[PDB]
Amino acid sequence: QLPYLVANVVEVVGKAAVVKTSSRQTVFLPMVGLVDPDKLKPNDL
Amino acid sequence: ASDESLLRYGGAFTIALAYAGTGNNSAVKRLLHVAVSDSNDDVRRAAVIALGFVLLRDYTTVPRIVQLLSKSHNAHVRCGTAFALGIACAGKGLQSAIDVLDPLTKDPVDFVRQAAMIALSMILIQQTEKLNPQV
Amino acid sequence: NDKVRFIKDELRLLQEPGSYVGEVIKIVSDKKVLVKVQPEGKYIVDVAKDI
Amino acid sequence: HEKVTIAPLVLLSALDHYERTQTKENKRCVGVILGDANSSTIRVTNSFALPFEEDEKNSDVWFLDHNYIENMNEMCKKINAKEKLIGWYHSGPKLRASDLKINELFKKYTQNNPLLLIVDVKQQGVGLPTDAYVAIEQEKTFLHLPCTIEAEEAEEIGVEHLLRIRLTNQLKSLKGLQSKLKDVVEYLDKVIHTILGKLQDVFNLNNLQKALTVKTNDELMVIYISNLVRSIIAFDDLIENKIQNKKIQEQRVKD
Amino acid sequence: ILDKIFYGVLDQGNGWLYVYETPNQDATYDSALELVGQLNKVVDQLFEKAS
Amino acid sequence: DKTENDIKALQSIGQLIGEVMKELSEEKYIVKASSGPRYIVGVRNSVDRSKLKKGVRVTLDITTLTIMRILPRETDPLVYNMTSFEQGEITFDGIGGLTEQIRELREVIELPLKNPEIFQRVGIKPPKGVLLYGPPGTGKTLLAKAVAATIGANFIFSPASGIVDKYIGESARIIREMFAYAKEHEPCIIFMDEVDAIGGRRFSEGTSADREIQRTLMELLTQMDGFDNLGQTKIIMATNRPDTLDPALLRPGRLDRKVEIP
Amino acid sequence: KRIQSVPLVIGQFLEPIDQNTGIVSSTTGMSYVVRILSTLDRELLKPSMSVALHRHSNALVDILPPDSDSSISVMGENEKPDVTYADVGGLDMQKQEIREAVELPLVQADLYEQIGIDPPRGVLLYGPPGTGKTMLVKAVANSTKAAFIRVNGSEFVHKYLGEGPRMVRDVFRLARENAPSIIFIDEVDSIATKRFDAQTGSDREVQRILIELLTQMDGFDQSTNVKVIMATNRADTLDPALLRPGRLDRKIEFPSL
Amino acid sequence: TKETVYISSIALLKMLKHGRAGVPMEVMGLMLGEFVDDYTVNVVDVFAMPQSGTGVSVEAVDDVFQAKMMDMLKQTGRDQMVVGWYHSHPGFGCWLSSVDVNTQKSFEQLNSRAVAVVVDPIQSVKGKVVIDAFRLIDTGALINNLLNKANIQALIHGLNRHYYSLNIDYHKTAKETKMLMNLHYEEKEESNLAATKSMVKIAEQYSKRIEEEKELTEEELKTRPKKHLSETADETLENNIVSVLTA
Amino acid sequence: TLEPSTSITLAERQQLAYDLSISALLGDKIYNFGELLHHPIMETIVNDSNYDWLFQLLNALTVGDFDKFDSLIKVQISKIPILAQHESFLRQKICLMTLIETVFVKNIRMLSFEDISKATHLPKDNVEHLVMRAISLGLLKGSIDQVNELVTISWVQPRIISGDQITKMKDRLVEWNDQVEKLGKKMEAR
């Protein structure tokens, strides 16, 4: 549900993924398949 | 020996009452000892209140025992010395009691002002202007 | 005895959000003052009775 | 591997639970713990009381449910996901015959091996309350596991608000040796290495500290000289106090 | 040897080359040297005050 | 089971990244969180201290603001301020009949990249920076892609204006990222599209926005002048006209090779 | 102790107002009047210094070595820079010129003062860079065995109020502390070619950065053990305060001939 | 009279555990126990409600959840009745969120002795927990109990309900208190280990006190500070007592 | 992992007991018969195939006679060829254990070179070579000085059986305890 937080990414041990939020802040989430690869594509909310 | 706060508070009044009149060294040592070595805020105040009852007959001595304690840390202690003097020096008009109670009267801590005001009044009851300039 | 008491006062002081610096724009004769604070926007505030 | 971290809530719950259910000596209180344990550090992050009863005919005959376990972990999950059950709880009376025997039943609905925390949660003992054990058979074979505490940032600050040397360790040492001797005598009698062998020759020579004393001594002069400068310093500060008193007296005489 | 590049001495009479430097006694010497210097300082300061 | 895993992930929280400005002590660091301000932080559970160094990205707690784990540092691949095309999308041999330009470009680029060894033996450095000047519309652009294709170099296309962010240091950061990544992903072509905006001359000697241009331009001259040397990272500048290149660039040692389109 | 501990915000001390009270500007934009510790009030108290601030306390947690950072990218320190007399021979006039201006006060401040001539405190270098000039600058730093601090002078050029003034302040302080040192201003002409004739407007943000550089530059370097070397792509005129005696006193030419 | 709120070790801690993880963007929940009033109110225990996407209002008390949790607690001895409700919120001295009061008011038609307690973890990371408890006023109690109070009398004939602050206290048993302080075995055995490794590091710790002293003496010169020096002297004495003890 | 779960067969236990008996003579590393008294060689696994050899081995190990080696099993099967390398390794094993219990009640890493020779019953060069191998094999370390005639290697090896382990433990216990108690007493008093 909105109000929700979007993120405008421009980015194309275990795997680390960087998300760029539109609050202009970089955040750590893992890309170990807890967070799927197909939920990242540049230029996109 | 009961580890309840209320009961340790209650223990201090029991010496004051039991040993009342003429004072007894053993009785004062125990009460001063609780006053110094117990850090509980009810307990320290009750053990100072308690010295005044022991010491009603020998009332001259109470400003010296409580001299230190009046300028000592923690407001409950300072409260307890106001009472000590108030009970012990009542009716006599001891000049030394009044001198100790003066700072405490305009103390920041509100219940310290309160108890010193009650205390001053009991000593200085039916003592007048001219007899005492200070009143 | 003094040293404990000193340390307690110091501790009360060491709990604070700070004071804002501002510039008095103009004083109102009803006991408001108009201030531009550098921390924030512009505010109407109540003149102190300590000054 | 193993390295076990234990919530202060675990200890304090087990305490309160035993009195509040009116559990006497000669009845056990048994429990469950859950958290995260598929890691080198076993994280105990919560726990819960389990219904437990034992019979008059033999007291190693007993009742534990599994249904209170079926649906309670799926309420643990719902506040904090990752707080499923791996094992179990005990308050004592400790090290019974059927204190082995909760293991084979608790193997039915664990995901590794039942971790057995016996804890003296009447807090009556002296020293550790935590009699932690990995629950392995072979009988009450019971290899102990050393480790309590580690907790959350919020909890530790809260802990301190609630609450507000060589000899003690030596006395413990004496008691263990003394116990060890008594055991060895008993053990010969019943029957009719290396650890003991390092615990005698090694210490024969404050004892160890002797050999070290040679090196200690040189540095020991140095640190002594440092304390001497400090004594001089106290004298210097002292002289000022004497003058302060001296001044006051002098002003009182002028006046 | 005489500016102590070589860790030893000539033991003449045996006509053999032997170590004298069983490594450096004096390895905390400088720290001690300061320590003396502080203590002297102190003694002087106290004396002024005294009189 | 998977939908149930989405709630579990929602209680398996992320945490923000910042980059270490400098380490004061092993108990005091300056880290710049990406939410903006600078903070003094200490450490917390679950770290390595041998992946610590200045200028690495770290992970900081949301509610404790201390170093929970240490991350590698990352370029970030982009398509916004540096669009990267490994190889080119058009062939070098297939565009022959543009022959003269092709050969000059081979000889400056290909030979040092494949064989540093020959430039090294003589004792004169490998070539620096190349300029293509004359029409972009004759198929300049085709040539730049085409050279990249044969070397297998990483093609780095730059929008010069996009190097023009209006924030503190974002503009420093891009030059720095572009170079660092060139060294890792070397061989590489760094292609600067119409250089007048990161390498002006000034509007009229005056300034409106032509100081942003100077801020950019000093950074390129600095990398060049530096201890870091261009030879497996090649930079190629392109502009229609040479009459809004800076005099700095026109001086040998920031461009030395100047290819003209004949 | 524990109450005043990490996490922490960074601020800067502007000045002490009275006893046990100081004004700080924190880097965020919020300025606080705060207490200083009584054991930080005497004998460790500087009128402007870098501080550790608490984010609830509003009190002086710690005093920091001055190197507090900015949202601009950090400047470069190169102890012993690697360009060290590469190009030589036929630079005869420019090598001699550098040598008496730049090297000698760093090795000995004290001879200049004893003569009573002013030491060069700042020098301005004009003529091309990266063609014989830079090489010499780097070499001198290395031979005097001072830290080379390569300071990006077209990088003030931040677009915000003052991060940039805070950073210059940190750098001059830190240079006097880590003496001997070179602050090398790459393109000074960026933050000081403005208004000579009411042309080169749009330079209002660098005017604060300029004042900050002058107060730090002239107010130190009284005996000179820390050199400032100014560098310009060819030549550019500067605003009158740099150019006058007491600052850029040597003005060194690279020969046309 | 009015309430004084004794929170148990496990209750206090559970309040902090749930509230922190449920963050602002809130989780909500129930307090359990009982008391006999006029000077004794006890919070024994607490449990969490499971996050609902409408912030922390009356709509977020899941009645099936609470009912199932209460029954299951009961079967392990720990169930009792609701003595109030707690949560996590932005923190306010006039009531932590608007939602907590509007939830509290619905409760208040049923109860007449139910508190709202919230701890705010924003201000509980200065190393001193910020925790509040407030309740609304009731008529015929807080005027019958505590010229007289003109103020509070016009206030109660007026608004009928308004925030008032409830005191924070603790109560814990002796059993807890004894067996914290042998944890806070690790401490005794840890103490031996620490002594041994301290003597190892003493090479450096030696050298810095040598430095401290050089500063110290120099300082006293310049003045002629004294206070530091005395503190500076005391500390050095403590450290040697420790160095000697080790060995 | 055969015996405590049953499922056994007379054929299988015949192979295993006889096979163990040949292998135990044929090679070792720990000690040559103490471990076979906490080590079922014929404790109702099976007694067939002349398990007398195990007891014959302990007598043979002590005397260190060649005649006894042939009369241990039978000539050819005593030799192997296994025993040709084996006798030196086996030899050091008897010496090491016998001294380890005996020399000092505490267990200290001081041995006379002489009394290692006298006890092992071998010439002066030979023992030099045998010890040389023995340090290589580990369970030792700390650094024997082959001049000073000090076998000064550290105490660290396992100690045989539950028998004189227990005697030795009592003596050592009274001493470890007594030492602790003195330190404690002195501290207590002041």
UniProtKB/Swiss-Prot annotation, chain A:
Location of this chain's protein in the cell: Cytoplasm; Nucleus
Disulfide bonds: none
Top-rank taxon, per record: Eukaryota
PTMs per UniProt: N-acetylated by NAT1.
Function (record text): The 26S proteasome is involved in the ATP-dependent degradation of ubiquitinated proteins. The regulatory (or ATPase) complex confers ATP dependency and substrate specificity to the 26S complex.
Similarity annotation: Belongs to the AAA ATPase family.
Protein name: 26S proteasome regulatory subunit 6A
Organism this protein belongs to: Saccharomyces cerevisiae (strain ATCC 204508 / S288c)
Swiss-Prot record, chain F:
GO cellular component terms, semicolon-separated: nucleus; proteasome complex; proteasome regulatory particle, base subcomplex
Keywords attached to this entry: Acetylation, ATP-binding, Nucleotide-binding, Proteasome
The record's account of how the chain is modified after translation: N-acetylated by NAT1.
Gene Ontology terms for molecular function: ATP binding; ATP hydrolysis activity; proteasome-activating activity; protein domain specific binding; ubiquitin protein ligase binding
Keyword ATP-binding: yes
Binding of ATP, residues: G134, P135, P136, G137, T138, G139, K140, T141
Transmembrane segments: none
Annotated GO biological process: ERAD pathway; nucleotide-excision repair; positive regulation of RNA polymerase II transcription preinitiation complex assembly; positive regulation of transcription elongation by RNA polymerase II; proteasome regulatory particle assembly; proteasome-mediated ubiquitin-dependent protein catabolic process
Function: The 26S proteasome is involved in the ATP-dependent degradation of ubiquitinated proteins. The regulatory (or ATPase) complex confers ATP dependency and substrate specificity to the 26S complex.
Family: Belongs to the AAA ATPase family.
Protein name: 26S proteasome subunit RPT4
Source organism of this protein record: Saccharomyces cerevisiae (strain ATCC 204508 / S288c) (Baker's yeast)
UniProtKB/Swiss-Prot annotation, chain G:
Reported modifications of this chain: N-acetylated by NAT3.
Subcellular locations according to the entry: Cytoplasm; Nucleus
Domain of life: Eukaryota
Per UniProt, location of the Glycyl lysine isopeptide (Lys-Gly) (interchain with G-Cter in ubiquitin) cross-link in this chain: K194
A molecular-function term among this protein's GO annotations: ATP hydrolysis activity
One of the GO biological process terms: proteasome regulatory particle assembly
Any GO CC annotation of this UniProt entry: proteasome regulatory particle, base subcomplex
Keywords, in A-Z order: Acetylation, ATP-binding, Cytoplasm, Isopeptide bond, Nucleotide-binding, Nucleus, Proteasome, Ubl conjugation
Binding site for ATP: G127, P128, P129, G130, T131, G132, K133, T134
Similarity comment text for this entry: Belongs to the AAA ATPase family.
Role according to the record: The 26S proteasome is involved in the ATP-dependent degradation of ubiquitinated proteins. The regulatory (or ATPase) complex confers ATP dependency and substrate specificity to the 26S complex.
Protein name stated in the entry: 26S proteasome regulatory subunit 6B homolog
Organism field: Saccharomyces cerevisiae (strain ATCC 204508 / S288c)
Organism classification: Eukaryota, Fungi, Dikarya, Ascomycota, Saccharomycotina
Shown stretch of the complete protein: 87 to 343 of 428
UniProtKB/Swiss-Prot annotation, chain I:
GO (cellular component) term, any one: nucleus
Any GO MF annotation of the entry: structural molecule activity
Gene Ontology terms describing biological process: proteasome assembly; proteasome-mediated ubiquitin-dependent protein catabolic process; ubiquitin-dependent protein catabolic process
Residue intervals of the PCI domain: 1-158
Coiled-coil zones: none
Alphabetical keyword list: Proteasome
Further comment found in the protein's record: Present with 12400 molecules/cell in log phase SD medium.
Record's function text: Acts as a regulatory subunit of the 26S proteasome which is involved in the ATP-dependent degradation of ubiquitinated proteins.
Protein family according to the UniProt entry: Belongs to the proteasome subunit S11 family.
Protein name, as recorded: 26S proteasome regulatory subunit RPN9
UniProt source species: Saccharomyces cerevisiae (strain ATCC 204508 / S288c) (Baker's yeast)
Gene: RPN9
Full-protein positions shown: 198 to 387 of 393
